[PDB]
Write a protein that binds this ligand. Structure first.
Ligand SMILES: CC[C@@H]([C@H](C)O)n1ncn(-c2ccc(N3CCN(c4ccc(OC[C@@H]5CO[C@@](Cn6cncn6)(c6ccc(F)cc6F)C5)cc4)CC3)cc2)c1=O
Ligand SMILES: CC[C@@H]([C@H](C)O)n1ncn(-c2ccc(N3CCN(c4ccc(OC[C@@H]5CO[C@@](Cn6cncn6)(c6ccc(F)cc6F)C5)cc4)CC3)cc2)c1=O
Ligand code: HEM
Ligand code: HEM
Lengths: 447, 444
């Protein structure tokens, strides 16, 4: 009933090395060598059981927090969140907070988002992509466009007059760099007096100082009468099941969580999308994206992007499908849980790996081939946005952003990969994207 | 117009060594060799101007936050208050929060307290001081008594059905374990994971989970029973809005933290002085005062009708003040007598020092409850001015109920020649715990 452990060859470290050197190869190798889709690996002394069979995805995504907990495994994120916030808070309270954000990101809030986005893309374009052909780093540029377009959508004008996208990014970077992802396996690390923790602290107390100055100016305004909502006001008016409103630091915590969530996954999804579409091997697909946009006004609207872009959407999904930005979703097992024909014991870190599952040959024939036209051959094998009790809550907003960019970008430009092949993914980051140094691309305006 | 700085002779560290070795003696030595009550020391390179002349106290206490600020210096309190609460919030909002607590501790709320307190004290003595004679640590027992009474007064029955005094005391202890008082002088220490750093955060999230569950049960029955929690839940900031659970919680633990230590120390000192043979005269005085009351005390009895017990508690804080050194960051140049204290200095006024100026307090090391300040405003054991203590009433109400109930039924023998030495190594100073073994004798 215990799933097969893969033979340890390297004393205390376990497989931490041959994992990080090549996560996909190493997992595939495991799946084969143990003639089994469900297996256990060792990472610095900790048992990590991987649910690598797509037919078993529901055994990971559906059990409740009390059985499969995210708290313990995602605690290295307390820099982003703040100390008693998101996964660090009790489950009832965690749920309320994420629900408040979730309702702040529903399609019902997008009435004004497409123009917000389009404005910010064009403004980036007509300041950095403004020659008749130039050389840029595409990941970096998309990454900048996405932070700007996210702020424009979710921050009101009063907010952005004090805290523009450039300054939010800068603060966010300072907090982001405090993250030690190895802490999932070596929690001792979260106790080291590292100097990148002072920097994170300093940026958080600066973010809160500014938001507080904003809330005061908002309340002064509201007495002399009284209008226009955003992420902030929205959270600012959430009431918990108990009597009480959120505190500044929880409001702020959810804001930085929302923006960090979006910044990387969406950029990378955009970057990959465009790298794929620009590749000469996918002319047929580029052509299809162009036929899709062909009849659109210069100023797109809600319906253009939500309801009339199913081929750009497939492009995003497929990009995520082939090169998932989140490689391993994780939970600490709190009770023996059945999985396949196996029992996974209390104390195991249990993972489900979009990387591994999205390259299952039954589920996704020719996995390294990018093919928007495709569909999963096994039910619920695509888990790029997760599933279950912790489904991505920003999926729609993310894709709204990827699509609108693809739309605006390709309308006005072509691109040339300065390279024979699409970039190698770079697994050495917390959120995975194409290799930065390989993402230089020549833009070309359009006659 | 600068105050005179004491010669530095240990580079980097400054005077920290020679201050921590003897806070009082070092300070008086400066006060002497510069022939000045106002002077400047150096603590790990940070300027500290002590206002050590009781005549000039008001130049520390009266100015408002915007000139002499407590925020930067009392930041290190975050583990107790929570992020962005009390000393961590913007001035107005802090002021407001502390006014909400103030209103929860005024004399009006004390209607029920005395037979609650006295029930907890008696309950304690009937279980632990239960033989004709026995040995106990008096500091530990006073601490337990103070935690048990403060909870009985400030927490409803329903709250205490989830959290007894034992369990609250633990969680308070886990929060205080993350306090790093040296952070007054090394703020980096507030921005760093240290190994104790997580402890307060686990306790806090526990407490808040409990308060939330209690509140929900409180609102499920709401379709008497007023307490601290319901007080704060009903508070409305000067703008439209209420407190978050996080602030409410912060103010609750701030309150119990403040009261737990200072009151326990005050009681223990008081009982220690009163039990010493050299103070027999004063013990008889306290008994003549107590002898005139019923067995069952009331609000008026201990508040308005016990001026000698109150004198004993005050003279204890006078001799061995629990808070040695009160501080503010100087935000704008301030004149202090003759002398300008420059912007960016830490300005401090020390109750230890002032209560030992001979002009204000002759024979300062003698405990004499009969004495009075000979300089107006010299006693600052409870602070003064914009930040004067708001829990003083409640603190002394507990101390005095304990003194009356304790000496009515018991005598005590100090297992030692002398009143204990104060131990200056804790953040809220009390007598040395190991010197506090005492023998209780049940009377007639
Ligand atoms: C010397 C040896 C050396 C080499 C081997 O030589 N070496 N030494 C050490 N390592 C090493 C180092 C690190 C690792 N990683 C461990 C960390 N893992 C990881 C990744 C992502 C995670 O994300 C968690 C949440 C889920 O969703 C997000 C994101 N999101 C959702 N929507 C949009 N974004 C989310 C949720 C909610 C929110 F509100 C917000 C959010 F963002 C974040 C969690 C864990 C990857 C592997 C492995 C090995 C080595 O390689
Ligand atoms: C080397 C290993 C390390 C670790 C720790 O082992 N370590 N080892 C030793 N030291 C160490 C120890 C001490 C010092 N000094 C001692 C003098 N200082 C000091 C400053 C401010 C204080 O009080 C601030 C407020 C004022 O009022 C209170 C209290 N209150 C009001 N009413 C009733 N109580 C208040 C107010 C409002 C509320 F709502 C609540 C409250 F409580 C709290 C008190 C003392 C710090 C510097 C330096 C270093 C270490 O750091
Ligand atoms: C567009 C690319 C995105 C991808 C590929 C993505 C991916 C994911 C995945 C795989 C999960 C599962 C987490 C787990 O099981 O541990 C997740 C959850 C989550 N995502 Fe996303 N996400 C994206 C965009 C966004 C955006 C824009 C937001 C906006 C804030 C967001 C916020 C969240 C949150 C808060 C959760 C966790 C909710 C919970 O624990 O219930 N994501 N996302
Ligand atoms: C014998 C018992 C007590 C003593 C000896 C004492 C002493 C003091 C002192 C010296 C200050 C001045 C702080 C400064 O100037 O920096 C102060 C302030 C304060 N005390 Fe106490 N105190 C006692 C009891 C309490 C209790 C029981 C509470 C709450 C229940 C309390 C709450 C406060 C608060 C909230 C402040 C200052 C807030 C502000 O900055 O305005 N005290 N106390």
């Amino acid at each position: 009933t215990d799933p097969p452990v893969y033979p340890v060859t390297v004393p205390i470290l376990g497989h931490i090395i041959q994992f990080g050197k090549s996560p996909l190869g190493f997992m595939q190798e495991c799946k084969r060598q143990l003639k089994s889709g469900i297996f256990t690996i060792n990472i610095v002394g900790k048992r990590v059981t991987i649910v690598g069979d797509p037919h078993e995805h529901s055994r990971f995504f559906l059990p409740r927090n009390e059985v499969l907990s995210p708290r313990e495994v995602y605690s290295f994120m307390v820099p982003v969140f703040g100390e008693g916030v998101a996964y660090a808070a009790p489950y009832p309270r965690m749920r309320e907070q994420l629900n408040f954000l979730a309702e702040e990101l529903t399609i019902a809030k997008f009435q004004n988002f497409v123009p917000a986005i389009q404005h910010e893309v064009r403004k980036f374009m007509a300041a950095n992509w403004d020659k008749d052909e130039g050389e840029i780093n595409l990941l970096e540029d998309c990454s900048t466009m996405i932070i700007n377009t996210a702020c424009q959508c979710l921050f009101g004008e009063d907010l952005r007059k004090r805290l523009d996208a450039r300054r939010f990014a800068q603060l966010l970077a300072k907090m982001e760099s405090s993250l030690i992802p190895a802490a999932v396996f070596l929690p001792i690390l979260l106790k080291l007096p590292l100097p990148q923790s002072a920097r994170c602290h300093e940026a958080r107390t600066e973010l809160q100082k500014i938001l507080s100055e904003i809330i005061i100016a908002r309340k002064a305004a509201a007495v002399n009468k009284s209008s226009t909502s955003d992420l902030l006001s929205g959270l600012l008016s959430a009431v918990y099941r108990d009597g009480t409103p959120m505190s500044l630091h929880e409001v702020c915590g959810m804001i930085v969580a929302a923006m960090f969530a979006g910044q990387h996954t969406s950029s990378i999804t955009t970057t990959w999308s465009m790298l794929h579409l620009m590749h000469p091997a996918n002319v047929k697909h580029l052509e299809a994206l162009r036929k899709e946009i062909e009849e659109f006004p210069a100023q797109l609207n809600y319906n253009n992007v939500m309801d009339e872009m199913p081929f750009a959407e497939r492009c995003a999904r497929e990009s995520i499908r082939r090169d998932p930005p989140l490689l391993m979703l994780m939970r600490k097992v709190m009770a023996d849980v059945k999985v396949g024909s196996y029992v996974v014991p209390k104390g195991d870190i249990i993972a489900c790996s979009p990387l591994l599952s999205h390259h299952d040959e039954e589920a996704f024939p020719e996995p390294r081939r990018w093919d928007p036209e495709r569909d999963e051959k096994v039910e619920g094998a695509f888990i790029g946005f997760g599933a279950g009790v912790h489904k991505c809550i920003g999926q729609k907003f993310g894709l709204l952003q990827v699509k609108t960019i693809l739309a605006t970008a390709f309308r006005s430009y072509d691109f040339q990969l300065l390279r024979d092949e699409v970039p190698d993914p770079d697994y050495h980051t917390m959120v995975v994207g194409p290799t930065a140094s390989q993402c230089r691309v020549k833009y070309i305006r359009r006659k």
